[PDB]
Ligand binder design. Sequence first.
Ligand SMILES: *[C@@H]1O[C@H](CO)[C@@H](O)[C@H](O)[C@H]1NC(C)=O
Lengths: 48, 49, 49
Amino acid sequence: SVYAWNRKRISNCVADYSVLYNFAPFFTFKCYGVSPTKLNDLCFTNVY
Amino acid sequence: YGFRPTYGVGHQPYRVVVLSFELLHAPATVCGPKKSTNLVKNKCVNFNF
Amino acid sequence: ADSFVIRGNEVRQIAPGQTGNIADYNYKLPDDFTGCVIAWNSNKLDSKV
Ligand SMILES: *[C@@H]1O[C@H](CO)[C@@H](O)[C@H](O)[C@H]1NC(C)=O
Protein backbone atom coordinates (compact mmCIF):
# COMPACT_ATOMS: atom_id res chain seq x y z
CA SER A 1 0.00 0.00 0.00
CA VAL A 2 1.12 3.56 -0.69
CA TYR A 3 1.01 4.49 3.02
CA ALA A 4 2.96 1.39 4.17
CA TRP A 5 5.68 0.54 1.65
CA ASN A 6 8.28 -2.18 2.04
CA ARG A 7 11.87 -0.90 2.21
CA LYS A 8 13.80 -3.87 0.83
CA ARG A 9 17.57 -3.99 1.33
CA ILE A 10 19.83 -5.03 -1.55
CA SER A 11 23.43 -5.70 -0.53
CA ASN A 12 26.46 -7.93 -1.09
CA CYS A 13 25.46 -8.97 -4.61
CA VAL A 14 26.47 -8.28 -8.19
CA ALA A 15 23.80 -6.12 -9.83
CA ASP A 16 23.53 -6.46 -13.62
CA TYR A 17 21.28 -3.54 -14.57
CA SER A 18 21.24 -4.49 -18.26
CA VAL A 19 18.76 -7.35 -17.76
CA LEU A 20 15.88 -5.38 -16.22
CA TYR A 21 13.80 -4.61 -19.31
CA ASN A 22 12.08 -8.02 -19.34
CA PHE A 23 10.52 -8.12 -15.85
CA ALA A 24 8.32 -5.04 -16.31
CA PRO A 25 8.69 -3.04 -19.55
CA PHE A 26 7.17 0.32 -20.59
CA PHE A 27 8.85 2.29 -17.81
CA THR A 28 10.17 5.84 -17.33
CA PHE A 29 13.39 5.28 -15.28
CA LYS A 30 13.50 9.01 -14.30
CA CYS A 31 17.10 8.89 -13.09
CA TYR A 32 17.63 11.83 -10.75
CA GLY A 33 21.33 11.12 -10.43
CA VAL A 34 23.29 8.26 -11.98
CA SER A 35 22.67 7.84 -15.70
CA PRO A 36 20.43 5.05 -17.06
CA THR A 37 23.33 3.23 -18.69
CA LYS A 38 25.89 3.95 -15.95
CA LEU A 39 24.61 1.71 -13.14
CA ASN A 40 26.92 -1.07 -14.38
CA ASP A 41 29.98 1.16 -13.90
CA LEU A 42 30.36 1.88 -10.16
CA CYS A 43 29.82 0.39 -6.72
CA PHE A 44 26.92 1.18 -4.38
CA THR A 45 27.18 0.82 -0.61
CA ASN A 46 23.43 0.34 -0.06
CA VAL A 47 20.56 -0.03 -2.52
CA TYR A 48 16.98 0.24 -1.25
CA TYR B 1 10.46 -11.11 -31.08
CA GLY B 2 6.92 -12.09 -32.02
CA PHE B 3 3.47 -12.21 -30.45
CA ARG B 4 -0.27 -11.97 -30.97
CA PRO B 5 -1.57 -8.36 -31.20
CA THR B 6 -2.38 -8.45 -27.47
CA TYR B 7 0.70 -9.02 -25.30
CA GLY B 8 2.46 -7.57 -22.26
CA VAL B 9 2.28 -3.99 -23.68
CA GLY B 10 6.03 -3.27 -23.39
CA HIS B 11 7.00 -5.45 -26.35
CA GLN B 12 4.54 -3.67 -28.70
CA PRO B 13 6.64 -2.51 -31.67
CA TYR B 14 7.43 0.96 -32.99
CA ARG B 15 8.35 2.18 -36.48
CA VAL B 16 11.32 4.56 -36.17
CA VAL B 17 12.56 6.72 -39.06
CA VAL B 18 15.42 9.16 -38.49
CA LEU B 19 16.24 12.35 -40.41
CA SER B 20 19.96 13.11 -40.18
CA PHE B 21 20.46 16.55 -41.73
CA GLU B 22 23.81 18.04 -42.72
CA LEU B 23 24.95 21.59 -43.40
CA LEU B 24 27.94 23.61 -44.72
CA HIS B 25 29.90 21.29 -47.13
CA ALA B 26 28.83 21.30 -50.83
CA PRO B 27 26.33 23.60 -52.55
CA ALA B 28 22.87 22.80 -51.24
CA THR B 29 20.44 20.40 -52.90
CA VAL B 30 17.53 20.39 -50.45
CA CYS B 31 16.14 23.90 -49.96
CA GLY B 32 12.51 23.83 -48.81
CA PRO B 33 10.03 26.42 -50.08
CA LYS B 34 11.53 29.16 -52.25
CA LYS B 35 10.73 32.88 -52.18
CA SER B 36 13.67 33.80 -54.40
CA THR B 37 14.21 37.47 -55.26
CA ASN B 38 16.27 39.31 -57.88
CA LEU B 39 19.68 40.78 -57.09
CA VAL B 40 21.03 44.22 -56.25
CA LYS B 41 24.75 44.93 -56.14
CA ASN B 42 25.38 48.35 -54.59
CA LYS B 43 23.10 48.74 -51.54
CA CYS B 44 22.47 47.16 -48.16
CA VAL B 45 19.90 44.35 -47.94
CA ASN B 46 18.64 41.63 -45.62
CA PHE B 47 20.13 38.78 -47.61
CA ASN B 48 19.43 35.05 -47.34
CA PHE B 49 22.08 32.86 -48.99
CA ALA C 1 16.08 8.58 -43.77
CA ASP C 2 16.74 5.28 -41.99
CA SER C 3 13.68 3.21 -41.08
CA PHE C 4 13.56 0.11 -38.86
CA VAL C 5 11.48 -1.57 -36.16
CA ILE C 6 12.37 -1.56 -32.45
CA ARG C 7 9.84 -2.47 -29.84
CA GLY C 8 9.12 -0.07 -26.99
CA ASN C 9 11.97 0.36 -24.54
CA GLU C 10 14.66 2.23 -26.52
CA VAL C 11 12.71 5.08 -28.15
CA ARG C 12 14.35 7.50 -25.69
CA GLN C 13 17.51 5.36 -25.46
CA ILE C 14 18.34 6.29 -29.08
CA ALA C 15 19.77 9.53 -27.64
CA PRO C 16 23.57 9.98 -27.98
CA GLY C 17 24.29 9.62 -24.27
CA GLN C 18 22.28 6.46 -23.67
CA THR C 19 23.90 3.17 -24.66
CA GLY C 20 23.26 -0.53 -24.23
CA ASN C 21 22.02 -3.43 -26.34
CA ILE C 22 20.85 -1.12 -29.15
CA ALA C 23 23.46 1.64 -29.31
CA ASP C 24 26.39 -0.80 -29.10
CA TYR C 25 25.01 -3.60 -31.31
CA ASN C 26 22.47 -1.88 -33.62
CA TYR C 27 21.81 1.61 -35.05
CA LYS C 28 24.27 3.89 -33.25
CA LEU C 29 23.79 7.64 -33.14
CA PRO C 30 27.03 9.65 -32.70
CA ASP C 31 27.93 11.71 -29.64
CA ASP C 32 27.28 14.94 -31.53
CA PHE C 33 24.35 14.81 -33.94
CA THR C 34 21.96 17.25 -35.59
CA GLY C 35 18.63 15.87 -36.78
CA CYS C 36 15.25 14.63 -35.59
CA VAL C 37 13.74 11.14 -35.38
CA ILE C 38 10.08 10.18 -35.82
CA ALA C 39 8.34 7.15 -34.30
CA TRP C 40 4.73 5.96 -34.10
CA ASN C 41 2.77 3.12 -32.54
CA SER C 42 2.62 -0.30 -34.20
CA ASN C 43 0.15 -2.02 -31.88
CA LYS C 44 -1.79 -3.91 -34.57
CA LEU C 45 -0.55 -2.81 -37.99
CA ASP C 46 2.96 -4.25 -37.46
CA SER C 47 2.22 -6.92 -34.85
CA LYS C 48 0.59 -9.72 -36.94
CA VAL C 49 -0.26 -13.23 -35.73
C1 LIG D 1 7.09 -14.21 -12.33
O1 LIG D 1 6.98 -15.52 -11.76
C2 LIG D 1 6.21 -16.44 -12.55
C3 LIG D 1 6.12 -17.73 -11.76
O2 LIG D 1 5.42 -17.55 -10.54
C4 LIG D 1 6.85 -16.62 -13.92
O3 LIG D 1 6.04 -17.48 -14.72
C5 LIG D 1 7.01 -15.27 -14.61
O4 LIG D 1 7.71 -15.42 -15.83
C6 LIG D 1 7.76 -14.29 -13.71
N1 LIG D 1 7.84 -12.98 -14.33
C7 LIG D 1 8.99 -12.33 -14.56
C8 LIG D 1 10.25 -13.02 -14.14
O5 LIG D 1 9.01 -11.22 -15.09
